Design a protein around this ligand. Structure first.
Ligand SMILES: Nc1nc2c(ncn2[C@@H]2O[C@H](COP(=O)(O)OP(=O)(O)OP(=O)(O)O)[C@@H](O)[C@H]2O)c(=O)[nH]1
Ligand SMILES: Nc1ncnc2c1ncn2[C@@H]1O[C@H](COP(=O)(O)OP(=O)(O)CP(=O)(O)O)[C@@H](O)[C@H]1O
Ligand SMILES: Nc1nc2c(ncn2[C@@H]2O[C@H](COP(=O)(O)OP(=O)(O)O)[C@@H](O)[C@H]2O)c(=O)[nH]1
Ligand SMILES: [Ca+2]
Ligand SMILES: [Ca+2]
Ligand SMILES: [Ca+2]
Ligand SMILES: [Mg+2]
Ligand SMILES: [Mg+2]
Ligand SMILES: [Mg+2]
Lengths: 437, 54, 332, 423
């Protein structure tokens, strides 16, 4: 058994982490006070769920998690929330004033003053680990803390834990819920300095979650709570193999091996199905073929793009529920004759499949209906470069007039870091075009 | 349409289905960049206070 | 009040479409780089499809199908017909074609069996970088032209009389956002004004080559469907619908239904439509052959008004309603 | 605990500042004695942004009242909410400034500025994390204009990393006290270009036109003008005073609203402006909010282009319908929003509406049309200055003509900087 430490940075990271650990507790039968009646080894053990939870002698199951925010109001939601008894105060780290949607403020000005404190609290969790796998970092692209302090933390984690893997869950900015005009700046600044430090990053476009909540859950104006409930389902699908018995994606290294052949192209596209409204008293349970087919509809992707105009480098199917391999193969053979699924010439055209028999867990009273089976597809498509192209265009528009650039220079950042970060993204777009055509 | 590496356990199973065969900066350098930006902030504030003293 | 942008100043078709939208008083044109549009009359090359459908509260429509170049390129069409089981390579309506940069050994394979069996062994070479085309019966001459797409030259074309002259049929096809296939009821025959000599200009029926005996028989070397149908009745005792138009509708449906899974915007964050230009050849046995597909075609001068209005009716106003000249080729 | 320190200086600043505290105390349920008598936890959740807490669960505004004459501040202490202000925070002189920028900035004002800074220091010392400062003042007089800008410069020297925000009342010949107001305003504007991060431009010409044309008031008074400023000041601070995600503090507002450091002068707008029980729909709020007749700066937005826009909706309404109408205004007039700043219109919604309104809308726009306000002031300045008219009032206080010439050049630069981004 090898441990995984989760790090949640900024408002988006903390609120999403809160939604994940709630879901984890429901999935593992852990009560809000930390007790877990099904766990018979009291005070220890090396089960699969221990990769995410430590155990005290009193029987409490403590998340291997650290929450960081430069403003205390979001983390105070954890201190007084339903699951406050899970975390001890050392795991929650707050500052006085935030980064004000400024990458430079979160990375240089305030990051410098708090980076040692965060690392020290992370070190305390690592000392409890008999064999640390690595870290899962939850953060936004557009926030000053989520972009600025994360990229500093990722650099320092590569220094203090060089042999450890690092995975990202990143919130891509969408103007329908975004809080700042300079979020394209922060997104590109943080992708530039984090790129060489993240082994595999899962991008979640808020635009996609928003429309899935409107279209499938009949939410007229979705809130962060609606978005985070859905996002935690996808995150749980991805991390379920680390927390349960299995053979696919059983350690963080296997994510890179199965999804990232080219290290810079480490942004798998996630697609999730089905998303059923809980207000529906009775909905027809979709088959294996139907939920597998839905994995190739753009309307269910975590980032809107067209995989048809792109090539695949890898493709994992993560099923949860009443699924057997026979139905999976029958569905794949059918989909191959109806869908445009072009792989690159230097990779096998195939699917790594994982099935966990426990059906998805939903938060009681939430908006997601319990389903008998669900699937999350992780596919490395060059089509996800479309999201980079959108982001880079908005950057080019503002930077041509140097709009808002003085806010970053005022924090000690040089204007050259902008163009340096932009040229990296241009190189990244070029890599996708070479692989995709 | 080949199914390989079928691993079964009590809580599920995993396998691979094939359809077609194919055809860091040091701690010092980080502290240098952080201290460089702080010094650039200190310089801009000194110029402001010099301007305000005038 | 709907909004649209214009990103192709050379499109004669959509310059008129843009003109009609403004006449309705309910369509406002924006700057070419304004992203808050409902409609994009985009550019022919490097259209940023990846930036469409990301504007909240805006239903966005574009006048090109992403991926339709596979049908509207010389080598792409040949590869598509050979590799697609729907077209099965052995489809009767496409001349035996080969792509040369590869299919050099395959092209010379069937070439030897033709000249040995006393059969007509005349081929034609072309590519998408033309106004440069070579026609010859010796393969060595053709291959020397490429080193500076080869298909069988139809040596037995249907010749119009009086004149003993070649022609080609242009059909305009509109595919809307629901992938309905609308065939414009009006077509044109771009005729050669020179007698066909199977032993230069009388072989290429392009409107730019004939103008460079032009304009003798019909105005502008363009014969419309009414006169051509009348000639078929008087000369061959048959109609344009029976002898030719059934095969044209079959070829259009085959090509467009084949690529439908790859380009359809059915469940996509933006919708597409596109006007197409199919070019057909007719042999002396009244068999129709597909030559090429144009993704950015021009219209006949007499037909700009009708067709461009039809584009506004079924392709634009169907998505953005305000306050039939087409034949719907039904399909599954 | 992201505290703001409020300062009001001069006659206009203190009369407008008093009405501001009168309005938001009612919204937060604070009675004239400092006791909370509300019925919602939303009222107290961000109460510490503007109020300190004393013994007996008393809420004391974090406000500092400044003037060189005791008169207007005696009226404040005798006003409705007069007893709610901290008595030590009344800092006044006796000589006055005589509508003279030089007296407020150089002679009479310097004698008093240090004791104001002593009170500012005492408020900031008991702040968990001071965001910055907001100042209310006019630019046409002497204390608010001359001493207000002196205060701002000395606050920046002592708190160089805090945000400085001002509500600045622009003079107008329509509502004028003396002819030297263009001189006083031109001198102050250059100070504001350098030493504030955000300035709400409140034009007395616009306030008068709205009272006369729209509200149907043939003889508007300062009280009538200040009613519009109260409603506007309450609206633009809603995001600071109540829980929310957008522009929740002064620095995030500046990052969203200011693409260039010198172009930080905002046009505020309010809706409705009824001359009254009729319920206003969301489309009506959005159309009026963007109408020039609802702007407080007397500039035509159609004569310029929006750099950034912030819209705040108050009341219980459909947030879906709010988004549809906001997206409708932009998509139907996209030529007036600059294309080189994508998605530069941000919208916030707050359930608590102002007093006596089911719902309202507040507009904060950084438009390049604001150059019309500075052009107007610049012309009135030049009309007198080309003949050195009334300059003796200022040279008598030690100022040189060169300082006026430099202030004139600086404001023409500001106009030119707005013009280049309009193109
Ligand atoms: N899906 C989702 N997105 C969020 C959430 N909270 C914020 N965001 C997005 O994150 C971006 C803003 O970044 P934040 O995380 O809020 O900012 P921050 O990391 O706290 O950094 P600061 O600037 O210091 O506040 C916007 O694009 C929001 O849409 C959340 O709970 N769920
Ligand atoms: N296999 C074949 N047999 C007979 N004629 C042929 C032929 N292939 C091409 N042609 C002649 O070539 C002409 C079409 O050339 P092609 O369409 O390749 O050039 P082009 O694409 O520049 C004209 P367009 O504007 O329609 O795209 C027709 O007039 C036809 O007569
Ligand atoms: N809107 C408004 N403007 C005022 C008020 N009092 C004065 N003014 C304006 O402010 C300018 C005079 O400044 P004033 O505040 O009286 O001078 P000060 O006391 O020395 O700062 C003129 O332009 C007046 O029109 C007021 O109560 N409301
Ligand atoms: Ca145990
Ligand atoms: Ca590494
Ligand atoms: Ca004195
Ligand atoms: Mg934050
Ligand atoms: Mg062509
Ligand atoms: Mg006065």
């Amino acid at each position: 058994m090898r441990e995984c430490i989760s790090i949640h940075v900024g408002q988006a990271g903390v609120q999403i982490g809160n939604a994940c650990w709630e879901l984890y507790c429901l999935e593992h039968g852990i009560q809000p006070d930390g007790q877990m009646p099904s766990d018979k080894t009291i005070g220890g053990g090396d089960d699969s769920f221990n990769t995410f939870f430590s155990e005290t002698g009193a029987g409490k199951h403590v998340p291997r998690a650290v929450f960081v925010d430069l403003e205390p109001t979001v983390i105070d939601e954890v201190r007084t929330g339903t699951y406050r008894q899970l975390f001890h105060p050392e795991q929650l780290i707050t500052g006085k004033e935030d980064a004000a949607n400024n990458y430079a403020r979160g990375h240089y000005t305030i990051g410098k003053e708090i980076i040692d404190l965060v690392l020290d609290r992370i070190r305390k969790l690592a000392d409890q680990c008999t064999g640390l796998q690595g870290f899962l970092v939850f953060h936004s692209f557009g926030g000053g803390t989520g972009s600025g302090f994360t990229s500093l933390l990722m650099e320092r984690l590569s220094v203090d834990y060089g042999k450890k893997s690092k995975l990202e869950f990143s919130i891509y900015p969408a103007p329908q819920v975004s809080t700042a005009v300079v979020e394209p700046y922060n997104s590109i600044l943080t992708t530039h300095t984090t790129l060489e430090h993240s082994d595999c990053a899962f991008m979640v476009d808020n635009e996609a979650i928003y429309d899935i909540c409107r279209r499938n859950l009949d939410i007229e104006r979705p809130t962060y709570t609606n978005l985070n409930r859905l996002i935690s389902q996808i995150v749980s699908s991805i991390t379920a193999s680390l927390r349960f018995d299995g053979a696919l994606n059983v350690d963080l290294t296997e994510f890179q091996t199965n999804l990232v052949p080219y290290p810079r192209i480490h942004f798998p596209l996630a697609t999730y199905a089905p998303v059923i409204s809980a207000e529906k008293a009775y909905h027809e349970q979709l088959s294996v073929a139907e939920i597998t087919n839905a994995c190739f509809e753009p309307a269910n992707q975590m980032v809107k793009c067209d995989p048809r105009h792109g090539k695949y480098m890898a493709c994992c199917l993560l099923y949860r529920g009443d699924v057997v391999p026979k139905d999976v193969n029958a569905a794949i053979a059918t989909i191959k004759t109806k869908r445009s699924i072009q792989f690159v010439d230097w990779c096998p055209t195939g699917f790594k499949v994982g099935i966990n028999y426990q059906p998805p867990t939903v938060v009681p009273g939430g908006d997601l209906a319990k389903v008998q089976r669900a699937v999350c597809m992780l596919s490395n498509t060059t089509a996800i470069a479309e999201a980079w192209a959108r982001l880079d265009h908005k950057f080019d528009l503002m930077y041509a007039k140097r709009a808002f650039v003085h806010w970053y220079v005022g924090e000690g950042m040089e204007e050259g870091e902008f163009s340096e970060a932009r040229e990296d993204m241009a190189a990244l777009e070029k890599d996708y075009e070479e692989v995709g055509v | 349409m080949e199914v390989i590496e079928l691993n079964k356990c009590t809580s599920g199973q995993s396998f691979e289905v094939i359809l077609k065969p194919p055809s860091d900066p040091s701690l010092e350098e980080i502290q240098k960049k952080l201290e460089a930006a702080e010094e650039r902030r200190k310089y801009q504030e000194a110029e402001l206070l010099k301007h305000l003293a005038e | 009040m709907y909004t649209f942008v214009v990103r192709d100043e050379n499109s004669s078709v959509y310059a008129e479409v843009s003109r009609l939208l403004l006449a309705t008083g309910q369509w406002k044109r924006l700057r070419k780089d304004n992203p808050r549009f409902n409609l994009m009359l985009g550019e022919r090359n490097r259209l940023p499809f990846g930036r469409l459908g990301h504007e909240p509260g805006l239903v966005q429509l574009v006048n090109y199908y992403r991926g339709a170049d596979k049908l509207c390129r010389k080598a792409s069409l040949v590869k598509l017909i050979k590799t697609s089981p729907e077209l099965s390579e052995s489809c009767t309506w496409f001349p035996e074609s080969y792509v040369i940069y590869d299919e050099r050994e395959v092209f010379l394979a069937a070439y030897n069996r033709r000249r040995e069996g006393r059969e007509g062994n005349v081929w034609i070479a072309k590519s998408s970088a033309g106004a440069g085309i070579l026609i010859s019966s010796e393969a060595s001459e053709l291959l020397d032209f490429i080193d500076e797409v080869i298909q069988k030259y139809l040596e037995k074309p249907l010749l119009l009389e009086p004149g003993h002259r070649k022609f080609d049929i242009r059909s305009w096809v509109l595919v809307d956002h629901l992938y309905n296939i609308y065939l414009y009821r009006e077509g044109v025959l771009r005729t050669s004004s020179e007698p066909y000599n199977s032993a230069k200009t009388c072989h290429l029926t392009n409107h730019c080559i004939q103008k460079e005996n032009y304009g003798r028989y019909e105005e502008g070397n363009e014969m419309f469907f009414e006169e051509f149908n009348q000639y078929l009745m008087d000369a061959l005792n048959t109609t344009l619908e029976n002898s030719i138009l059934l095969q044209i509708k079959h070829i259009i449906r085959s090509c467009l239904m084949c690529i439908e899974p790859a380009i359809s915007t059915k469940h996509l964050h933006y919708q597409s439509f596109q006007l197409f230009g199919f070019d057909f050849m007719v042999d002396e046995e009244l068999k129709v052959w597909l030559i090429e597909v144009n993704g950015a075609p021009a219209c006949a001068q007499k037909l700009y008004a009708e067709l461009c209005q039809g584009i506004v009716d079924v392709a634009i106003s169907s998505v953005f309603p305000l306050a039939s000249i087409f034949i719907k080729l039904h399909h599954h | 605990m992201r505290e703001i320190v409020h300062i009001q200086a001069g006659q206009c600043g203190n009369q407008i500042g008093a009405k501001f505290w009168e309005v938001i105390s009612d919204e937060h349920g604070i009675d004239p004695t400092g006791s909370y008598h509300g019925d919602s936890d939303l009222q107290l959740e961000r109460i510490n942004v503007y109020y300190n807490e004393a013994t007996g669960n008393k809420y004391v505004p974090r406000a500092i009242l400044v003037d060189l004459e005791p008169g207007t501040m005696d009226s404040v202490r005798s006003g409705p909410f007069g007893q709610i202000f901290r008595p030590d925070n009344f800092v006044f002189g006796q000589s006055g400034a005589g509508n003279n920028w030089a007296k407020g900035h150089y002679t009479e004002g310097a004698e008093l500025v240090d004791s104001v800074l002593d009170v500012v220091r005492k408020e900031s010392e008991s702040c968990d994390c001071l965001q910055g400062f907001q100042l209310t003042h006019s630019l046409g007089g002497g204390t608010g204009s001359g001493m207000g800008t002196l205060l701002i410069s000395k606050i920046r020297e002592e708190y160089p990393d805090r945000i400085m925000n001002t509500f600045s009342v622009m003079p107008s010949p329509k509502v004028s006290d003396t002819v030297v107001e263009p001189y006083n305003a031109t001198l102050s504007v250059h100070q504001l270009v350098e030493n504030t991060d955000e300035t709400y431009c409140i034009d007395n010409e616009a306030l008068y036109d709205i009272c006369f044309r729209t509200l149907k008031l043939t003889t508007p008074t300062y009280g009538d003008l200040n009613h519009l400023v109260s409603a506007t000041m309450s609206g633009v601070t809603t995001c600071l005073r109540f829980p929310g995600q957008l522009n929740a503090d002064l620095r995030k507002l500046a990052v969203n609203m200011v693409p260039f450091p010198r172009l930080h002068f905002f046009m505020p707008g309010f809706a409705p402006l009824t001359s009254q029980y009729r319920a206003l729909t969301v489309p009506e709020l959005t159309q009026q909010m963007f109408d020039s007749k609802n702007m407080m700066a007397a500039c035509d937005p159609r004569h310029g282009r929006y750099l950034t826009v912030a819209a705040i909706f108050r009341g219980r309404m459909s947030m879906k319908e709010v988004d549809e109408q906001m997206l409708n205004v932009q998509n139907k007039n996209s030529s007036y929003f600059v294309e080189w700043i994508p998605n530069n219109v941000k919208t916030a919604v707050c359930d608590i509406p102002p007093r006596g309104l089911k719902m309202s809308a507040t507009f904060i726009g950084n438009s390049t049309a604001i150059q019309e306000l500075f052009k107007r002031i610049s012309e009135q300045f030049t009309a007198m200055f080309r003949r050195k008219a009334f300059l003796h009032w200022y040279t008598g206080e030690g100022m040189d003509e060169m300082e006026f010439t430099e202030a004139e050049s600086n404001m023409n630069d500001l106009v030119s900087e707005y013009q280049q981004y309009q193109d």
